[PDB]
Amino acid sequence: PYSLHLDHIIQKAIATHQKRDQILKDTEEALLINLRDSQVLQHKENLEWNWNLIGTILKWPNVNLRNYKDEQLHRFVRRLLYFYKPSSKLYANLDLDFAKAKQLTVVGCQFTEFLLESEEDGQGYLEDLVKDIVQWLNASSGMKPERSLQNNGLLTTLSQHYFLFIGTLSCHPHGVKMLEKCSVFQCLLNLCSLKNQDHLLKLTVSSLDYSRDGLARVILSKILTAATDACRLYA
Amino acid sequence: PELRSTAMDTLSSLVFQLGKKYQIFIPMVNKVLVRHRINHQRYDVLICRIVKGYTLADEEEDPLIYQHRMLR
Numbered sequence: 001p002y003s004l005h006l007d008h009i010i011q012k013a014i015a016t017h018q019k020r021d022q023i024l025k026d027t028e029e030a031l032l033i034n035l036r037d038s039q040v041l042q043h044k045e046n047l048e049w050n051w052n053l054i055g056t057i058l059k060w061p062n063v064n065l066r067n068y069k070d071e072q073l074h075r076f077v078r079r080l081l082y083f084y085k086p087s088s089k090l091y092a093n094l095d096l097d098f099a100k101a102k103q104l105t106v107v108g109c110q111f112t113e114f115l116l117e118s119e120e121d122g123q124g125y126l127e128d129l130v131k132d133i134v135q136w137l138n139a140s141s142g143m144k145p146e147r148s149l150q151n152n153g154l155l156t157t158l159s160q161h162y163f164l165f166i167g168t169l170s171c172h173p174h175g176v177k178m179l180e181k182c183s184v185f186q187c188l189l190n191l192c193s194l195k196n197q198d199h200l201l202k203l204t205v206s207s208l209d210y211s212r213d214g215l216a217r218v219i220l221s222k223i224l225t226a227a228t229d230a231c232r233l234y235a
Numbered sequence: 236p237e238l239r240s241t242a243m244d245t246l247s248s249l250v251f252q253l254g255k256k257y258q259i260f261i262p263m264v265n266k267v268l269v270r271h272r273i274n275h276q277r278y279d280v281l282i283c284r285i286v287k288g289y290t291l292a293d294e295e296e297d298p299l300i301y302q303h304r305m306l307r
């Protein structure tokens with residue numbers, strides 16, 4: 001898979017096919033060495049961080065912000081949250097064909113699932129991130145009277161990858177609950193009815209997860225039954 | 236005890252070419268690594284991307300293809 005949506009789809013299908021029919025500890029020391037060499041806490045300048053090391057801290061098994069209560073890790077996740085939010089205008093402004101574009105998106109997906117990996121301590125960051133995402137998507141979709149037109153910013157920058165975060169938020173059973181705690185599914189339900197933007201329905205119909213029964217199949221059925229004819233054909 | 240860093244760098248440069256073909260060797264080397272408290276940062280990055288998935292296209296890739304695509 002060349003793309004990152006089809007990659008997540010095939011990985012989720014392989015994961016559920018493996019899950020239907022049935023590592024190092026590094027407590028506090030090596031974690032501190034890895035977050036020291038990661039260069040996130042030394043300086044706030046973006047694009048100079050060591051993103052391989054960030055991916056290795058976020059994808060290590062037993063570090064999940066629930067068993068290692070250290071203030072440096074909270075500083076690290078707060079800096080990554082402020083970088084990844086679209087309101088701060090840092091990640092959502094880098095254009096396509098970038099030198100490191102797929103890596104930042106992969107790190108973002110594993111970061112927003114790492115936040116969900118602590119279901120009792122990872123609310124204050126995840127709720128803020130998904131509220132900022134739905135705020136940006138309501139601002140760009142046309143639910144506001146300011147401009148109702150930002151197709152020139154979604155189509156050529158990395159800010160179109162914020163559906164993939166919702167995609168990797170939609171697979172887990174605790175993910176749909178957090179996604180419905182904010183007004184995300186209703187926002188896509190109102191997005192289904194508009195007539196001017198057809199690319200957003202292509203983005204949301206190829207990102208969500210339809211493995212289990214819920215509100216994700218209702219959006220797919222609403223696009224399939226009542227939508228634009230081109231979007232209906234693509235669905 | 237003195238050839239640890241050079242052998243770990245050689246091991247990291249070797250397992251960068253091997254994709255999921257090295258996943259069978261990880262519990263064999265992990266005993267020797269935790270026995271003498273050997274920590275290498277690039278090897279940790281590589282085995283973190285090997286055990287837990289990074290993407291699907293980069294794992295199990297011809298290394299000459301990568302060297303050609305990075306030379307350009």
Ligand SMILES: Nc1ncnc2c1ncn2[C@@H]1O[C@H](COP(=O)(O)OP(=O)(O)OP(O)(O)=S)[C@@H](O)[C@H]1O
Pocket residue numbers: 044045046074075076078079080082083090
């Ligand atoms: N480009 C940036 N990347 C990360 N953080 C930034 C960036 N630019 C400004 N910041 C600020 O850094 C804040 C997060 O830092 P904290 O998690 O509070 O760690 P900190 O070291 O206490 O920060 P300060 O500035 O010393 S209070 C962001 O919410 C912003 O206030």
